[PDB]
């Protein structure tokens, strides 16, 4: 049996993690000055006073509880939660909430595509050739201007048929740091009402671009034009409990019957896979959400992060800029979110990493939370020396 | 397009537990719960939990993306639990799910992935989950005989007999011990002729261990896993830490894939760990650690055997009064199976007439197969479900 198991090949990002003076700018994972992930405080305060307060580890609900269902609604939806006409689903990690709605649309629909991002993040594609979906691309970025091919994007996402579904970045992202702005945005609405392609957003990094409730504001725009939409939201990230596993899916509906259907397929789909969703990070989120006093000081500290590392792309700009004169590599600046794209082809990539022990991930896509004033030079130089 | 989603019926538990909460009786019982419970109907955190989650909280310093298969302090600690010192790391791969379900999944997924023509052999009955499972994913399903109802006991000849109607490269799924939902197990020796079916018809057994200590105790519970991990060189195995650690909510379990040579372990931890990143990426590390955190500390993990013991004992000595009091009132050891089961559960052997008709006229809830929860009885309900028993001629 075992034995015809034929070898898989490994994941772009977590393969570097494993082959990883070093500096490691690879994994999707937010570092303080001193190349450290810490835990939140409002997150260490919620996990002491759960210790305290639970009483048993009984079975709970199928679909997650409905204290993190309502908080998660609020926080990615705000005012615009329809509560009548969507359906939550406590899933492991926003990964397990892609995967979710993968599955939910499905069923929905056997002859779908997904349209997905010019680049995106690596997991989306080889899900999806897991399932066996037919996958199309877009374009989104502009190898150039190093943003948004805007013109491109609206003319292949044109062709999306009724039926099809349409994969976005709700915000920062992965792994451009090219973003859409909201006129922009708009336009994409009147182009999924047009086709009526079922639009699924990945939100993985609400905080980490220009805010909770600006980096939310695309995605709202959606949900108030299209009446049906499917987030699939990550608490990772935003709520630094990444090992926790805990995310969601919001299925937005037209009517309320409809939300009935798909909540009970929902419901199913977490039986089907892994029963029960992990309770802990989903009890830590509902916890400091809930919590006025506790979502004071984890909104601070997460406005604290967010201005480091816009403060770290105007620094490495600098510094580039030195070593050039006053020429493009200003995109750093422009680019929101964790990550950056620079250009350096393949084979740059790994003459950095094997010469200048620096670590990012082949498509020259670096974590700018992970660097500091202390090795932006070493990194300008390396870059510098690299050529191209 | 969701509209034109086929209605999923509910899970049928919460249809059982309204039915129960909206009835208006003073005195209605249920033993249709899933969990233990102890006396006071509470279903407690176990110390040595209590005391590991503890340690966390003062020790970890980070949470940031661990282990895809899981943490090695977690898969060794597993691995030996249920092996013992038979277990040799070379050739076992190791994979943290989400709760035992999740090791089941990952497990049909790895096999058909091994063999896309698979055939899985389940037990008449099972668990209800196991069927459901197959039938979204597609899997053949094939039934062998187990359920003696006369007897409440395991028909034998029959499992063997349709056993052996297994082809090479299909799987045949065994509750590794206090068989969910009858209660009725086979002993040391009938899984050595189990052993010998396996064998001879190259049958891949999948075991779904998600009860090692409710039974007769750790390792008296891991007997006919090891004996069919000794003498077949592939299997699969999907444990649980729900139960037994008593952290059902956490979502903690694991699947361990023995298999003929380190070339093959290699071979399968890769996709192991594919599965992992395709479904949910990283597995959750809360429970994970409470467990490896409890077997690895010493003193926590004496409690953690100690408290587990007191349960074991506790059923055991409840299921004794049980068959004694129907003892008392039959004038017949018609009931004496009631003692012989092992686990949690067992079945009655009363028909949907009896359930309902013991429903309607003591007030006592059960499963529709008339599958019981030990724990949910004490010295009040053992004389009324006695009589109910005796009463609807069951
Ligand atoms: C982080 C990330 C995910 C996955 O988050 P998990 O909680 O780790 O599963 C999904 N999509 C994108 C774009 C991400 O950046
Ligand atoms: C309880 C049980 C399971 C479930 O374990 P989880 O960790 O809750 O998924 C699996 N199989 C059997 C036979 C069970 O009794």
């Given at each position: 049996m075992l034995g015809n198991l034929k070898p898989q090949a490994p994941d772009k990002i977590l393969a570097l993690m494993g082959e990883?003076?070093?500096?490691?700018?690879?994994?999707?994972?937010?570092?303080?000055?001193?190349?450290?992930?810490?835990?939140?405080?409002?997150?260490?305060a919620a996990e002491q006073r759960m210790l305290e307060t639970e009483t048993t580890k009984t079975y709970?609900?199928?679909?997650?509880?409905?204290?993190?269902?309502?908080?998660?609604?609020?926080?990615?939806?705000?005012?615009?939660?329809?509560?009548?006409?969507?359906?939550?689903?406590?899933?492991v990690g926003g990964t397990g909430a892609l995967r979710q709605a993968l599955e939910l649309a499905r069923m929905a629909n056997p002859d779908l595509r997904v349209f997905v991002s010019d680049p995106t993040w690596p997991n989306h594609v080889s899900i999806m050739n897991f399932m066996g979906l037919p996958v199309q691309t877009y374009?989104?970025?502009?190898?150039?201007?190093?943003?948004?091919?805007?013109?491109?994007?609206?003319?292949?996402?044109?062709?999306?048929?009724?039926?099809?579904?349409?994969?976005?970045?709700?915000?920062?992202?992965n792994p451009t740091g090219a973003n859409l702005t909201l006129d922009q945005w708009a336009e994409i609405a009147s182009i999924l009402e047009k086709t009526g392609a079922?639009?699924?957003?990945?939100?993985?990094?609400?905080?980490?671009?220009?805010?909770?409730?600006?980096?939310?504001?695309?995605?709202?725009?959606?949900?108030?034009?299209?009446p049906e939409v499917l987030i699939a939201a990550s608490?990772?990230?935003?709520?630094?409990?990444?090992?926790?596993?805990?995310?969601?899916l919001l299925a937005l509906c037209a009517d309320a019957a409809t939300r009935e259907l798909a909540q009970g397929a929902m419901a199913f789909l977490n039986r089907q896979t892994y029963s029960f969703?992990?309770?802990h990070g989903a009890?830590?989120?509902?916890?400091?959400?809930?919590?006025?006093?506790?979502?004071?000081?984890?909104?601070?500290?997460?406005?604290?992060?967010?201005?480091?590392?816009?403060?770290?792309?105007?620094?490495?700009?600098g510094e580039l800029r030195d070593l050039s004169g006053?020429?493009?590599?200003?995109?750093?600046?422009?680019?929101?979110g964790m990550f950056s794209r620079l250009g350096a082809t393949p084979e740059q990539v790994k003459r950095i990493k094997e010469e200048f022990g620096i670590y990012m991930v082949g498509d020259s896509r670096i974590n700018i939370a992970g660097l500091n004033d202390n090795t932006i030079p070493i990194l300008a130089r390396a870059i510098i020396e690299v050529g191209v």
């Amino acid at each position: 049996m075992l034995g015809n198991l034929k070898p898989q090949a490994p994941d772009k990002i977590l393969a570097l993690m494993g082959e990883f003076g070093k500096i490691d700018l690879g994994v999707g994972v937010y570092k303080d000055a001193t190349g450290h992930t810490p835990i939140m405080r409002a997150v260490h305060a919620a996990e002491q006073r759960m210790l305290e307060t639970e009483t048993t580890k009984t079975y709970a609900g199928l679909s997650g509880e409905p204290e993190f269902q309502k908080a998660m609604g609020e926080l990615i939806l705000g005012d615009g939660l329809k509560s009548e006409t969507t359906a939550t689903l406590a899933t492991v990690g926003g990964t397990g909430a892609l995967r979710q709605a993968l599955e939910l649309a499905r069923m929905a629909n056997p002859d779908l595509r997904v349209f997905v991002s010019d680049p995106t993040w690596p997991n989306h594609v080889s899900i999806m050739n897991f399932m066996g979906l037919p996958v199309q691309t877009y374009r989104y970025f502009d190898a150039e201007t190093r943003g948004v091919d805007f013109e491109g994007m609206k003319a292949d996402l044109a062709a999306a048929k009724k039926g099809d579904m349409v994969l976005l970045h709700g915000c920062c992202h992965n792994p451009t740091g090219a973003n859409l702005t909201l006129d922009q945005w708009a336009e994409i609405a009147s182009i999924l009402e047009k086709t009526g392609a079922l639009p699924l957003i990945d939100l993985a990094y609400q905080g980490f671009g220009d805010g909770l409730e600006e980096d939310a504001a695309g995605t709202r725009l959606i949900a108030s034009r299209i009446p049906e939409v499917l987030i699939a939201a990550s608490c990772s990230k935003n709520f630094g409990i990444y090992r926790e596993r805990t995310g969601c899916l919001l299925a937005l509906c037209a009517d309320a019957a409809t939300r009935e259907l798909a909540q009970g397929a929902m419901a199913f789909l977490n039986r089907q896979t892994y029963s029960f969703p992990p309770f802990h990070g989903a009890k830590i989120v509902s916890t400091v959400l809930t919590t006025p006093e506790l979502r004071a000081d984890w909104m601070a500290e997460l406005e604290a992060v967010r201005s480091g590392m816009l403060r770290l792309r105007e620094q490495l700009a600098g510094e580039l800029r030195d070593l050039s004169g006053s020429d493009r590599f200003g995109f750093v600046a422009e680019h929101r979110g964790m990550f950056s794209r620079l250009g350096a082809t393949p084979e740059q990539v790994k003459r950095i990493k094997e010469e200048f022990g620096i670590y990012m991930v082949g498509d020259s896509r670096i974590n700018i939370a992970g660097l500091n004033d202390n090795t932006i030079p070493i990194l300008a130089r390396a870059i510098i020396e690299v050529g191209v």
